[PDB]
Design a protein around this ligand. Sequence first.
Ligand SMILES: Cc1ncc(COP(=O)(O)O)c(CN)c1O
Ligand SMILES: *Cc1c(COP(=O)(O)O)cnc(C)c1O
Lengths: 453, 451
Amino acid sequence: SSLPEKDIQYQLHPYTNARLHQELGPLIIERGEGIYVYDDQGKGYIEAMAGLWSAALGFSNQRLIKAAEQQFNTLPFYHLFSHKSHRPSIELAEKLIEMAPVPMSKVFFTNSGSEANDTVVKMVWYLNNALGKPAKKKFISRVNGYHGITVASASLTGLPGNQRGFDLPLPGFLHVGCPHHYRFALAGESEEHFADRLAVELEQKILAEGPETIAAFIGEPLMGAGGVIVPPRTYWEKIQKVCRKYDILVIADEVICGFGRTGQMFGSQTFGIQPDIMVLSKQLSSSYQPIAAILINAPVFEGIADQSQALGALGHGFTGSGHPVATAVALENLKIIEEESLVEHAAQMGQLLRSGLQHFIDHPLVGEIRGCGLIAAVELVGDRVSKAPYQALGTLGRYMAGRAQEHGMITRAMGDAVAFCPPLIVNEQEVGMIVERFARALDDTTQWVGPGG
Amino acid sequence: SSLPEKDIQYQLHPYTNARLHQELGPLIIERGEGIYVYDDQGKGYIEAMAGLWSAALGFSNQRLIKAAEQQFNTLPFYHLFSHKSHRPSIELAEKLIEMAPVPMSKVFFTNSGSEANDTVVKMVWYLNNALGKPAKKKFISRVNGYHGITVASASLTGLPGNQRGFDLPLPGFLHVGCPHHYRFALAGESEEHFADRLAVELEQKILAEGPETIAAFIGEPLMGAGGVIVPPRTYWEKIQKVCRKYDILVIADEVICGFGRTGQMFGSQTFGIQPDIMVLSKQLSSSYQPIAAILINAPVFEGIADQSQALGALGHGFTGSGHPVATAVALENLKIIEEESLVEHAAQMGQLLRSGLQHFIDHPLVGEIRGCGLIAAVELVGDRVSKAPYQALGTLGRYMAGRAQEHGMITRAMGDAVAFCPPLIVNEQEVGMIVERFARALDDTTQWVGP
Ligand SMILES: Cc1ncc(COP(=O)(O)O)c(CN)c1O
Ligand SMILES: *Cc1c(COP(=O)(O)O)cnc(C)c1O
């Protein structure tokens, strides 16, 4: 029995068509090194997505690996329940609070981003009950935002693909508009007037629902999985004014943006967000270990704290919350990012990536090139004037990603946009190779479509 | 400045009184070895809970540690999205299906048990939509069952402590009775007649709600966190008849019972459960890595599979689903359990534990001693006739656990019951030490309650 046959027999794959997978089987990844991964046929790929927007230090950082070993051989598992604690969790939490872009009080650990946001939901409901505001429970998020896939976090998520067939969203989970100018501005509307209109939509939803009932607003500084959507200029400023105006919490989902992805350490810095709560994962540990972290500010903590006392204890926690190996790896991961000045380096590499892609700005199939820092996307279209897809929406993106893989590069399509989110350690010539391989895929795709003009 | 000061400054602790924690600070655990952990003052404790019911191979198994290293140096992270895969996930899924106590089709990986059950809920809703039964969505679980703490999995959970202040449970999440004879049988009622009444309660709830609306029943074979509650004889047989009778899925939550805890490899074996879906974690990896697994049978898979095609792809998955290091460690973990015959050894050690605790059956503060395999609990009461707590529920359990710690043993109180769930590798004399330290805490607690 072959390894692909076993995979087809025994695994149900996430984000995969199960029937198609029975026919095609897997692409088996065997090993990784630097920014590369290699399949079981020996073929090498530049992992331009850093796996899942996550492997900041690439796929063979020995320091992370040794940090795991050292912790394993000390204390391979323990927990944080009932006052129990341990050094790595404590030192990681310290570090996270000291590097926070706004004053923060406490860290709560989970395994995943989905768990983290699911936990943030519970925390907010518990908070407002403590403050004697039992109706202030509803969450507002955006269309195409992604925040995980638990029943609750998938209700925060605004991608239909995460909701169809799952009876989601739940009640109490509301969605306002995707802040993507290219797709949702009115013709002749500026970015600033687009922002104004989005801020007005929000105020209108708050009033229509009853401000007293709205607990929180959650957003990725820029949207990752939904298309590498940069919000229009002034979006965050104006959205925050509306939130402060109705005493609504601002939650920044920094699962992707966190730790140098957007040109600064956090997307909250890059986009001037002053969040009450932040959510972190992915680059936190370069995904070498499953871990996520929630940062909460003083008011949120004090409320939760009072209530935990009134009720005996805080009735919430995962077995793996603050896992010593995962926290130890994350701690070392963050140190490395500081010591090797990878935020500033990622910013420089980002400028190269973007400049290199922009040689294609006038290509007949390129509708928009977007991004900031070391995250980017090229959205292809069949017609630039109408912005319509070639064939069905997603056809170009799917063909490109296929061709990129053929040319030794792994990118993810999101509809007809292809993303780039390489490891932070990518070097100058590697960025060139990424753009080259993008170009070869574009060329192939262009031959295939035959635009004329 | 000091490590405890940092913890107080920067960490919000789960299952902890936050204000009390600001005053007392943490108990910092520095290192582990065998069944022991040591605090930062050098003091050693028998981890009689195996951490969180989980550390099957104890706290210094070198083989798990090497398996991690070997995987780290090969491929330290990758994912299973969009047809991507990798050896450890594949080989682990193979093994899990091989060793399943009933025929199973597929494995889906998560990081946690809470994620797993939360995922099982979504899967069942997605399944029944695929089959054109859009009303068949409700879940039935039990009072005092524990199934995790996501918004949904905490609604499956039937412990009020996980629901107060969280606006839970959600609608669609229903609870029938805790199958705990000592607390809920009528005077003079046999275990079998208790079972009958519970099976009738369930049928009645199904009919009262509309069988067409009931998707699934979920249960831990025996309840862990809710008190180490062994169901009465015939409970599972009768509950299953009721479920098959209304085409209701049976989900076995084996997060604790999995991998030799109850005397056999699974609680489903020990209690004759033939589940459609199983949920696994904890001893899966001795908690050396955060990982959980869902096993689904053929019908569940085929429905989900068709739907994933209709909708383009299965719109669900965690970044860490099937993580190569966690799956690699779990794979080695399971091999070790087989190779060292720890299921049978745990069973023997379980006999010793339970027989040692039984010397305290006639103690004035002991209401019930329960368990099977290598999981057990002693429930203290203020009065044995009435079964009432001293002072208020949880006061005795809290004091015992405190005293046990003083005597070098870590146990968890669940109300006024103290639990035992030691590593599978515990040896005979270590079981004696556990019982001795239990005894010293009981003595202290008894002097404290006093005349
Ligand atoms: C029976 C059971 N099910 C589910 C869970 C949830 O596990 P996790 O803590 O990994 O979310 C637990 C955790 N103690 C459990 O005991
Ligand atoms: C991928 C992602 C998540 C979910 O994290 P998991 O660890 O996959 O549950 C949450 N938020 C954002 C912004 C993400 O991109």
